[PDB]
Ligand binder design. Structure first.
Ligand SMILES: Nc1ncnc2c1ncn2[C@@H]1O[C@H](COP(=O)(O)OP(=O)(O)O)[C@@H](O)[C@H]1O
Ligand SMILES: [Mg+2]
Lengths: 588, 206, 169, 460, 25, 57, 132
């Protein structure tokens, strides 16, 4: 047939006929305006199509042009600094070509420009007759000041090289490589295409074992995360990772985001900068965005995740470390519930499709550290941070999969304590993997992490009993434990996100602060315990009277600015306070 | 004249309400006042006194006409009104008159056909709008609107419709809201320039 | 002061009511002129009907245009009685162009037993063979159908463009 | 170009049920098309095609299906989707929920015809809003501040004074001084006293020449509510993005809109969401709420203030729940404050404004505004916890510090929240009423505030 | 539960009327 | 007394402005009326029959 | 929807008030003695006294040739009605024409004649009269 006809329409769902050769998840083009849709059910010579665009004004007997391919994404030069639709339409090019604030229905623009010329350099070790395989790097494009864009043979492509282009400037339409296998030939340009629903293959997945630093002390200290991690969070961190992290490339997916909040990200990110080789550069040179505001079509909302993870697997394969942020996995699960309802399926719990946990697990299990395909030996990774927006089925399904979970506390948020993460329901399962990194690079931190979690849990039981008895019965060691728990909550776990001194707290600052607070806890508790069974007995009030300057210095340790002061000064200042503490306790 | 019960009788203009509907209760009249042209609900469990408040308001209020509707409620609660209201008298020009001379009743008791409870409500409000148009101040008592909502649930159930909250049809809120919008104080149609009103006091049986 | 402020409040309300009537008077004045223009358009068309050569050139098109909406195996044309020879000629010209364009055979009949009223300016209605579907193609149908869609353009042509409308996109 | 070809008229009605009429033998049916129905008595109704299949079309009828029949009633199919006429002459006019006049003026002589669904604005072309609207209400301007171009609902319930808060915002709104709004007002399912109150207030303020009203009252047809927000917002988009006005849009009960969707969805026998609402309720509401804000290269804007009656005061109900996932905040009206004759009854704890963080502060309003808002919030949060404890243990268990928080909680509700309906407070008065409460505490308790802000503003 | 039944019944009726139309083809 | 005087003044100016506006409309109309009619009838009398684009043999 | 009415109801009420105003004018003044009021009501009294049909004044109301505001016509109508009640309740006796014109001017100037104490005084006369 090559084109069917529309038989019926009801919202974003189209039924078409003479679709006899059609396959599950083929894309089609519907109507005289050629709207994209994806096939999702077959019955004889009829197909049901989920349309990615508004169907208003579509008529019975309209054409359905039957394309041969599944939903798939253009991969190659020109992804850095791009803004994309959930379906990979280029929002900055559509704006420029149409000269208008609107998006036209059925608009067609290639996701990567064929007009721009890219500087290409081949791998120089390759010559005609060389044997090559999927994932082999065969050239480099100088896309940007930060990013050397490796050009790779597509996965499932292979053979013997018949032509390889000289160093020069080329269009994304120009043939840079040709090869042969079983007498069949392929001609290849700098751009490949991949189905977003298919995992990009690798030689080997590897254990994740290096921290993914975030600017926030709660997350770095109590609930660590790793390069190649899977994390769920409440929906601060988005800017923080982007301007300050161990990651090479950032991908942000605004899946179901509010109009004026997506507009914040799209204005804000291109203004931000980082310092590279003693020179300052925009972070937009190593970032790509997928934008999908809450009013865009429900099927594009669903695809927006698969686009962003495929773009992340593409830079993983080059041997980069990639960080992906998904702005709500709950607003994505909202789309699955709607599409499942439009298809007359039986739900499971709370109206969600019974396959929701398979859909989530298939997304999150695309994270990891890997040994890439093809000939140059590499490692790369994708780290996924998924916002959750509530007990509920989406949270319950997510906790079966993710290795780290950070939960919100409404008591902290309503007391205007930030970041408002609950340190008693949160968890991280990476700590045994990371303890060899902490053993190699810090040695002291594992005891400090352990003791801080004990103090925070011990005080949570005392905080129940003092509601009954009004504090009066409490022993001095236990008052010491209340008051130091508060020091930790207000002067370590609390962190202002906007002030320059605490915009990003490096790990040498993080270990330094906590080392002093735990050293204080030991000496203050030892003074009380050593003067039990005695005529002179030390109390928290005696320590507070004797050591008010040490409490003022301890509470002030947060103010050290890592932009103004170096490692040596910040360590020396904290070490001088440790001596001031010891001298004060020796003076008691 | 003959009028379709489902269609609102026209008026020149609806007016703000500016005068109390006195109930003769100390509570209600002091703490929680009502007006000539007002809309009231009386929710409460069995035995709280909804029908006794309805009957007391019917006997003693400052209204020119009473229309009393008993859809889906007891036959003895109708029989009490028929027994009492001929004996009880208001005073006019130094002469006493039975309050049954100012009263009409619309009965459809809890064992009469379920579908007729909808017709009781629209009959009683249409009768109330007719005397409003003469320039009278009218009160309508509807001694349980839950019995009407519960009738809609069976008819909707046998029509095999999809339910909203707790089995009720999705149109229940629109059926209630368009009934209560028939209350008010008005400039009547036509040219002798009179004004009249309907107050509605709907009991609810949760 | 309280009494003075009540006079100030009354002034605002009274002046506001004057200005609301003054706006509505100027708007009614436009729609009266537009309605008078549509009445002149109806009178201008009534001359085309008397000009029987041009009326046949319209009526040849009014029949064939109706047949292309309905696409039935059998159809019935209803017409103004005084125009019967003109529409009978128009049907005979329409049928060969209908068979050529559609590739379908057709039966087309004209009502002799019932007609459009003499009050109708002209044109036709065409019906399905059982009269459950019709297409109405009188001159008053075309005048109205075109006149409504042109309203943004007759506003601008008669009264000039709005100076505040900076963008059309 | 035009639709110059004739309109087909069908007597082929095949079923009638609730708000829906079903037709068959329809030639090449078009989804979302408009249909005009002439009844056997010559009454005219109007409707929209909700589904097409083969020769069969399902029409929702806006004015309801009473008096329709399967033989005499006929439908004319217009060939097109719903386009409303628009013009700048719509300011100072009153229309029903279908957009027909009710002020005894003429119908709109169009400057254009616009599709009531609007057209998608590119996320690249939007501007992030940073001008603060001074609403004149301290509980908003001090702790929940509104940017010009935001979407921010009022969440309320039956018996509470949300209409007075809405009217007061319309009287008092402007920019902070170291322009004035065109208003588009929509009503779904309001009673006659509510419609009279708002119309009377705009006349009492002497400003009706700058406002457009679309009214669907509780006796008007419920399916007109499906289009009423879309007529209002299509008018606001012409006024804002073609005539360069600053528009404020008020949508006065989204709960009675969401019930009209549930009727149509129930009549279609669609698969439910929570509480029987449509499974697509989020995606539908988002088409109304995301029609707001600012665009690059055009000087106008739209600010959106929806209003919700929450049923049973349940903020987790699907109507207020889904509205929070789309709009940039909420203002919450509280029965416990209303029962105590506080006005506005705004509870500052569940209230939020997500765009305030960048609209306030140095150069915008005053340099303390961020710190004072955080500290006032933390003091009220602690004071509400002390109040809840005190009712168990009695005042003999409370410390002197617990009495400082319990004193602050009274002085805050009596002076900062309580205001009265025609009082208008600047941001500066709002902040300096705020500091008179923060002075209840010694400096050492004000932990949210940095020493520079304490040093500059506490001694005064 | 009462709404997940009834939706099954309406689907069953549609499948029966569909099959009983194939008996006319 | 000033309020009572000001109302008659406002009514006078509002009336005169209403008469000016209505005068301007009738002048702009009669200057353009015939050119509009000549375009309306040019669209009405130019029939151009067409079949629906979804039609197939 | 004009006021709350259909267009047919709205224009049909206008014709009804134009007629009722004339019936009130003839029953206050059968002799054309009361020139001031017959001048102040001339714009509606022109349609009555003359020979004409309901269907003709209805076209004049749709055309806006006659007065056609029910807010203005209701105010105009009520002032004749509340004057006619006084003139009819004082059945055996007569007021002088300058006293009648004084009562008329006092009523025309009143903010809300329905809320007036004048209306209450007339209700109290009618309450005595209907018993007698
Ligand atoms: N105001 C009252 N004064 C005295 N007895 C009352 C009063 N209200 C209720 N009762 C008593 O309670 C009984 C139940 O009242 P009723 O109105 O029938 O309750 P329900 O709400 O169930 O209809 C009455 O028959 C009477 O015995
Ligand atoms: Mg009872």
């Amino acid at each position: 047939s090559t084109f069917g006809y529309v038989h019926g329409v009801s919202g974003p769902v189209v039924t078409a006929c003479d679709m006899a050769g059609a396959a599950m998840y083929e894309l089609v083009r519907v109507g005289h305006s050629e709207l994209v849709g994806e096939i999702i059910r077959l019955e004889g010579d009829m197909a049901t199509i989920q349309v990615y665009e508004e169907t208003s004004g579509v008529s019975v007997g309209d054409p359905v042009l039957r394309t041969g391919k599944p939903l798939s994404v253009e991969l190659g030069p020109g992804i850095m600094g791009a803004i994309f639709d959930g379906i990979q339409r280029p929002l900055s090019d559509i704006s420029s070509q149409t000269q208008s604030i609107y998006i036209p229905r059925g608009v067609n623009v290639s996701a990567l420009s064929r007009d721009i010329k890219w500087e290409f350099i081949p791998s120089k070790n390759l010559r005609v007759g060389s044997h090559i395989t999927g994932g082999d790097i065969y050239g480099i494009v100088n896309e940007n000041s930060l990013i050397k864009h490796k050009i790779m043979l597509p996965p499932r492509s292979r053979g013997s090289v018949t032509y390889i282009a000289p160093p020069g400037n080329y269009d994304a339409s120009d043939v840079v490589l040709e090869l042969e296998f079983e007498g069949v030939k392929e001609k290849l340009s700098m751009v490949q295409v991949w189905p977003v629903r298919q995992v990009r293959p690798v030689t080997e997945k590897l254990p994740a074992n290096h921290p993914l630093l975030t600017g926030q002390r709660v997350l770095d200290a109590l609930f660590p995360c790793v390069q190649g991690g899977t994390t769920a969070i409440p929906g601060v961190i988005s800017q923080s990772l982007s301007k300050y992290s161990n990651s090479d490339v950032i991908i942000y997916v605004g899946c179901g985001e509010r109009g004026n909040e997506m507009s914040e990200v799209l204005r804000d990110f291109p203004e931000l900068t980082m310092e590279v080789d003693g020179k300052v550069e925009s972070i937009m040179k190593r970032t790509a965005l997928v934008a999908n505001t809450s009013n865009m079509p429900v099927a594009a909302r669903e695809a927006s995740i698969y686009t962003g993870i495929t773009l992340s697997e593409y830079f993983r394969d080059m041997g980069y470390h990639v960080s992906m942020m998904a702005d709500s996995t709950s607003r994505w699960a909202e789309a699955l519930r709607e599409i499942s309802g439009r298809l007359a399926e039986m739900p499971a719990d709370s109206g969600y499709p019974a396959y929701l946990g398979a859909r989530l697990a298939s997304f999150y299990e695309r994270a990891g550290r890997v040994k890439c395909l093809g000939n140059p030996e590499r490692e790369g990774s994708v780290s996924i941070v998924g916002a959750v927006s509530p007990s509920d089925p989406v949270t319950s399904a997510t906790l079966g999969i993710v290795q780290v979970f950070w939960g919100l506390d409404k008591k902290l948020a309503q007391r205007k304590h930030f970041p408002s993460v609950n340190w008693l329901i949160s968890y991280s399962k990476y700590m045994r993997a990371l303890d060899e990194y902490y053993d190699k690079h810090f040695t002291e931190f594992v005891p400090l992490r352990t003791k801080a979690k004990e103090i925070l849990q011990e005080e949570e039981d005392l905080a129940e009993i003092v509601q009954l008895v009004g504090k009066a019965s409490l022993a001095e060691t236990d008052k010491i434990t209340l008051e130091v728990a508060k020091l930790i909550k207000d002067d370590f776990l609390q962190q202002n996100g906007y002030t320059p001194y605490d915009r990003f707290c490096p790990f040498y600052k993080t270990v330094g602060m906590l080392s002093n607070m735990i050293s204080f806890y030991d000496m203050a508790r030892r003074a009380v315990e050593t003067t039990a069974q005695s005529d002179n007995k030390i109390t928290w009030s005696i320590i507070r009277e004797h050591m008010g300057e040490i409490l003022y210095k301890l509470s002030s340790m947060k103010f050290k600015d890592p932009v103004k002061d170096g490692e040596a000064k910040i360590k020396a200042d904290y070490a001088q306070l440790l001596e001031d503490m010891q001298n004060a306790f020796r003076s008691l | 004249q003959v009028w379709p019960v489902r269609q609102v009788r026209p008026v020149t203009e609806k007016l703000p309400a500016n005068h109390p509907l006195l109930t003769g209760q100390r509570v209600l009249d002091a703490l929680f006042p009502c007006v000539q042209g007002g809309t009231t609900a009386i929710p409460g469990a069995f035995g709280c006194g909804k029908t006794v408040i309805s009957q007391s308001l019917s006997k003693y209020s400052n209204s020119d006409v009473i229309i009393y509707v008993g859809c889906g409620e007891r036959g003895n609660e109708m029989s009490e009104v028929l027994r009492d209201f001929p004996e009880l008298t208001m005073e006019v020009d130094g002469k006493v008159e039975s309050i049954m001379k100012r009263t009409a009743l619309v009965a459809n008791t809890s064992n009469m056909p379920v579908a007729a409870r909808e017709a009781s409500i629209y009959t009683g409000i249409t009768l109330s709008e007719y005397f409003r148009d003469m320039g009278y101040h009218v009160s309508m008592m509807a001694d349980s609107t839950s019995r009407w909502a519960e009738a809609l649930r069976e008819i909707s159930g046998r029509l095999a419709e999809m339910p909203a909250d707790s089995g009720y049809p999705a149109y229940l809120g629109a059926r209630l809201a368009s009934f209560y919008e028939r209350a008010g104080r008005v400039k009547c149609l036509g040219n002798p320039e009179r004004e009249g009103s309907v107050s509605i006091v709907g009991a609810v049986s949760p | 002061e309280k009494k003075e402020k009540q006079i100030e409040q009354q002034k605002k309300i009274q002046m506001s009511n004057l200005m609301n009537q003054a706006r509505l008077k100027v708007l009614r004045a436009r729609d009266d002129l537009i309605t008078d223009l549509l009445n002149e358009a109806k009178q201008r068309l009534s001359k085309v009907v008397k000009d029987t050569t041009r009326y046949q050139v319209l009526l040849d098109g009014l029949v064939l245009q109706g047949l292309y909406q309905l696409l039935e195996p059998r159809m019935i044309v209803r017409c103004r009685k005084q125009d019967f020879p003109l529409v009978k000629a128009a049907v005979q010209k329409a049928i060969p162009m209908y068979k050529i364009a559609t590739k379908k055979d057709v039966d087309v009949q004209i009502d002799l037993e019932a007609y459009l009223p003499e009050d109708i300016a002209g044109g036709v209605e065409i019906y399905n063979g059982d009269r459950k579907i019709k297409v109405s193609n009188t001159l008053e149908s075309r005048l109205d159908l075109i006149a409504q869609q042109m309203m943004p353009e007759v506003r601008g042509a008669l009264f000039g463009a709005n100076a505040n409308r900076k963008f059309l996109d | 170009n035009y639709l110059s070809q004739p309109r087909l008229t069908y007597k082929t009605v095949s079923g009638v049920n609730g708000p829906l009429v079903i037709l068959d033998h329809v030639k090449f049916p078009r989804y979302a098309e408009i249909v005009h129905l002439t009844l056997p008595d010559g009454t005219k109704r109007s409707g929209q095609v909700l589904e097409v299949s083969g020769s069969k079309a399902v029409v929702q009828v806006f004015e309801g299906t009473s008096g329709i029949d399967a033989k005499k009633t006929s439908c004319e199919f217009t060939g097109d989707i719903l386009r409303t006429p628009v013009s700048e002459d719509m300011l100072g006019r009153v229309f029903n929920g279908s957009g027909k006049p009710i002020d005894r003026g003429p119908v709109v002589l169009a400057e254009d015809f616009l599709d009531i669904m609007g057209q998608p604005i590119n996320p690249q072309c939007r501007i992030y809003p940073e001008e603060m609207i001074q609403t004149g209400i301290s509980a908003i301007d001090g702790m929940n501040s509104i940017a010009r171009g935001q979407k921010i609902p009022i969440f309320s319930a039956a018996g509470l004074p949300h209409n007075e808060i809405a009217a007061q915002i319309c009287r008092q709104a402007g920019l902070v001084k170291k322009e004035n709004f065109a208003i588009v007002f929509a009503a779904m399912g309001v009673n006659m006293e509510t419609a009279r109150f708002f119309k009377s207030d705009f006349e009492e303020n002497g400003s009706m020449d700058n406002v457009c009203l679309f009214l669907n009252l509780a006796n008007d047809p419920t399916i007109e509510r499906i289009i009423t927000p879309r007529l209002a917002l299509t008018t606001a988009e012409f006024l804002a993005y073609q005539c360069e006005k600053h528009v404020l849009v008020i949508l006065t009960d989204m709960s009675s809109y969401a019930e009209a969707l549930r009727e149509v969805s129930a009549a279609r026998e669609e698969v439910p969401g929570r509480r029987g609402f449509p499974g697509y309720m989020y995606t539908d509401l988002a088409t109304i709420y995301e029609r707001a804000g600012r665009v690059e290269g055009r000087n106008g804007s739209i600010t959106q203030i929806p209003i919700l009656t929450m049923p049973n005061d349940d903020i987790t109900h699907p109507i207020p729940d889904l509205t929070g996932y789309i709009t940039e905040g909420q203002i919450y009206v509280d029965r416990q404050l209303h029962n105590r004759q506080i006005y506005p009854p705004i509870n500052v704890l569940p209230s939020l404004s997500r765009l305030m963080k960048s609209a306030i502060g140095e150069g915008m309003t005053r340099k303390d505004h961020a710190d004072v808002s955080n500290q006032l919030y933390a003091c009220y949060a602690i004071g509400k916890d002390v109040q809840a404890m005190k009712a168990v243990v009695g005042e003999e268990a409370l410390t002197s510090d617990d009495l400082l928080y319990l004193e602050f909680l009274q002085k805050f509700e009596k002076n900062f929240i309580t205001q009265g309906p025609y009082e208008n407070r600047t941001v500066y008065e709002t902040l300096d009423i705020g500091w008179q409460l923060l002075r209840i505490f010694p400096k050492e308790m004000l932990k949210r505030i940095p020493q520079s802000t304490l040093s500059e503003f506490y001694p005064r | 539960f009462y709404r997940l039944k009834k939706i099954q019944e309406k689907k069953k009726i549609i499948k029966e009327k569909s099959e009983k139309d194939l008996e006319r083809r | 007394a000033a309020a009572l005087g000001s109302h008659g003044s406002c009514s006078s100016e509002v009336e005169k402005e209403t008469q000016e506006k209505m005068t301007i409309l009738q002048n702009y109309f009669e200057q353009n009326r015939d050119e509009v009619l000549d375009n309306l009838l040019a669209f009405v009398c130019d029939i151009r029959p067409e079949i629906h684009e979804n039609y197939r043999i | 929807k004009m006021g709350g009415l259909t267009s047919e109801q709205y224009h049909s009420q206008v014709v009804g008030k134009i007629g009722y105003i004339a019936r009130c004018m003839q029953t206050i003044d059968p002799e054309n003695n009361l020139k001031k009021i017959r001048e102040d009501y001339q714009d509606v009294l022109i349609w009555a006294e003359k020979n004409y049909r309901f269907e003709e004044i209805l076209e004049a109301s749709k055309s806006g040739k006659c007065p056609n505001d029910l807010d203005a016509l209701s105010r105009r109508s009520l002032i004749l009605q509340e004057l006619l009640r006084l003139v009819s309740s004082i059945s055996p006796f007569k007021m002088k024409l300058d006293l009648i014109e004084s009562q008329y001017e006092k009523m025309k100037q009143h903010v809300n004649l329905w809320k007036s104490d004048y209306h209450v005084k007339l209700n109290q006369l009618n309450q005595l009269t209907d018993y007698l």
